[PDB]
Design an enzyme around this catalytic site. Structure first.
Site, PDB file in Angstrom:
ATOM      1  CB  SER A  61       5.371 -29.715 -80.200  1.00  0.00           C
ATOM      2  OG  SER A  61       5.238 -28.496 -80.914  1.00  0.00           O
ATOM      3  N   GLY A  86       8.785 -26.103 -78.341  1.00  0.00           N
ATOM      4  CA  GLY A  86       9.313 -26.923 -77.251  1.00  0.00           C
ATOM      5  C   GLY A  86       8.194 -27.497 -76.409  1.00  0.00           C
ATOM      6  CG  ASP A 144       1.450 -32.957 -85.052  1.00  0.00           C
ATOM      7  OD1 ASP A 144       1.674 -31.744 -84.813  1.00  0.00           O
ATOM      8  OD2 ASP A 144       2.361 -33.838 -85.080  1.00  0.00           O
ATOM      9  CG  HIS A 160       5.402 -31.467 -84.951  1.00  0.00           C
ATOM     10  ND1 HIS A 160       4.209 -31.019 -84.411  1.00  0.00           N
ATOM     11  CD2 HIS A 160       6.426 -30.839 -84.320  1.00  0.00           C
ATOM     12  CE1 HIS A 160       4.534 -30.197 -83.425  1.00  0.00           C
ATOM     13  NE2 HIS A 160       5.862 -30.038 -83.349  1.00  0.00           N
TER      14      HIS A 160
HETATM   15  N1  239 Z   1       1.301 -20.615 -80.700  1.00  0.00           N
HETATM   16  C1  239 Z   1       1.408 -21.932 -80.258  1.00  0.00           C
HETATM   17  N2  239 Z   1       0.679 -22.457 -79.371  1.00  0.00           N
HETATM   18  C2  239 Z   1       2.447 -22.846 -80.860  1.00  0.00           C
HETATM   19  C3  239 Z   1       2.208 -24.275 -80.811  1.00  0.00           C
HETATM   20  C4  239 Z   1       3.134 -25.154 -81.334  1.00  0.00           C
HETATM   21  C5  239 Z   1       4.312 -24.653 -81.973  1.00  0.00           C
HETATM   22  C6  239 Z   1       5.248 -25.540 -82.589  1.00  0.00           C
HETATM   23  C7  239 Z   1       6.397 -25.031 -83.182  1.00  0.00           C
HETATM   24  C8  239 Z   1       7.411 -25.921 -83.869  1.00  0.00           C
HETATM   25  O1  239 Z   1       8.596 -25.643 -83.829  1.00  0.00           O
HETATM   26  N3  239 Z   1       6.904 -27.005 -84.612  1.00  0.00           N
HETATM   27  C9  239 Z   1       7.659 -27.961 -85.354  1.00  0.00           C
HETATM   28  C10 239 Z   1       7.016 -28.537 -86.487  1.00  0.00           C
HETATM   29  C11 239 Z   1       7.666 -29.523 -87.230  1.00  0.00           C
HETATM   30  C12 239 Z   1       8.950 -29.952 -86.872  1.00  0.00           C
HETATM   31  C13 239 Z   1       9.598 -31.086 -87.644  1.00  0.00           C
HETATM   32  N4  239 Z   1      10.400 -30.503 -88.733  1.00  0.00           N
HETATM   33  C14 239 Z   1       9.600 -29.372 -85.786  1.00  0.00           C
HETATM   34  C15 239 Z   1       8.970 -28.380 -85.017  1.00  0.00           C
HETATM   35  C16 239 Z   1       6.660 -23.623 -83.203  1.00  0.00           C
HETATM   36  C17 239 Z   1       5.752 -22.754 -82.643  1.00  0.00           C
HETATM   37  C18 239 Z   1       4.555 -23.261 -82.013  1.00  0.00           C
HETATM   38  C19 239 Z   1       3.609 -22.360 -81.446  1.00  0.00           C
END
Ligand code: 239
Length: 246
Positions: free
Chosen positions: A198, A196, A97, A46
């Site tokens: 991820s 951030g 993912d 992602h």
């Molecule tokens: N609660 C968590 N551990 C957690 C864990 C992971 C998380 C990931 C994103 C996020 O912004 N994801 C994302 C998904 C797809 C894309 C691509 N369009 C970009 C960012 C946002 C919040 C998140 C919160």
């Protein structure tokens, strides 16, 4: 990372800091990753799916701060960007993912292990830690959901693994969380991974060995009551990792 503590790369030497070069020359932070062998970093699809050009990425190993050239760090370009062919995103859940980045320096070399650059072991088939086990997460992600800047200094925290039966409860994620995903959270809901973080590692000490059990994937908000962090279960993907690194 919400809550937790500030750390440095010598405590997380497998951590890869992944940035993207934009047209015009600006460079911004994207996601975390983990060094699994000298030429290979593992992360989340992602992070890259919307900008799938390998030439745009910069990967650092041995880097402790978002904007400092840490002594001993190594800078790389991406020789091969491998995204999982069956990746998909639902409203909350992200499927398959997982991504692999083959790294190379401008001289054509892979990482040189050091005190601040080390690989992290992969798990074995069908052997993940039991529910209630404490594992660590690392990243440069948000300190609060309302922040727009990321912290200058690398952070870490510790969370507990949650069973599939509990994670599928109606007030948790129901049937949206699958057996290829692992939930982990704080029982008091005060610390968690966030935007951030991820692609970064969920490392569990299992049978005395530090292991890459999960990859930060998704969650409803950050550190919310009954909303665990959700991680790609690395043990399921061992056949895919082996085939794509040969
Ligand atoms: N609660 C968590 N551990 C957690 C864990 C992971 C998380 C990931 C994103 C996020 O912004 N994801 C994302 C998904 C797809 C894309 C691509 N369009 C970009 C960012 C946002 C919040 C998140 C919160």
């Amino acid at each position: 990372i919400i809550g937790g503590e500030f750390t440095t790369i010598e405590n997380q030497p497998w951590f890869a800091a992944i940035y993207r070069r934009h047209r015009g020359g600006s460079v911004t932070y994207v996601c975390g990753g983990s060094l699994i062998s000298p030429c290979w970093v593992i992360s989340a699809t992602h992070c890259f799916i919307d900008y799938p050009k390998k030439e745009d990425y910069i990967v650092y190993l041995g880097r402790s701060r978002l904007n400092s050239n840490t002594q001993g760090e190594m800078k790389f370009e991406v020789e091969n960007l491998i995204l999982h062919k069956d990746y998909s995103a639902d409203t909350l859940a992200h499927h398959n993912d997982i991504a692999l980045l083959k790294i190379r320096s401008k001289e054509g070399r892979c990482a040189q292990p050091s005190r601040t650059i080390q690989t992290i072991a992969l798990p074995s088939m069908y052997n993940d830690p039991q529910f209630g086990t404490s594992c660590e997460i690392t990243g440069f992600g948000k300190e609060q959901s309302t922040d727009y800047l990321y912290p200058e200094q690398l952070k870490m925290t510790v969370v507990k693994l949650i069973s599939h039966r509990e994670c599928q409860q109606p007030h948790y994620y129901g049937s949206e969380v699958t057996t290829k995903m692992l939930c982990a959270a704080d029982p008091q809901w005060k610390t968690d991974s966030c935007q951030g973080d991820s692609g970064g590692p969920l490392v569990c000490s299992l049978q005395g060995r530090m292991t890459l059990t999960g990859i930060v994937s998704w969650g409803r908000g950050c550190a919310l009551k009954d909303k665990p962090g959700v991680y790609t279960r690395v043990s399921h993907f061992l056949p895919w990792i082996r085939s794509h690194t040969k």
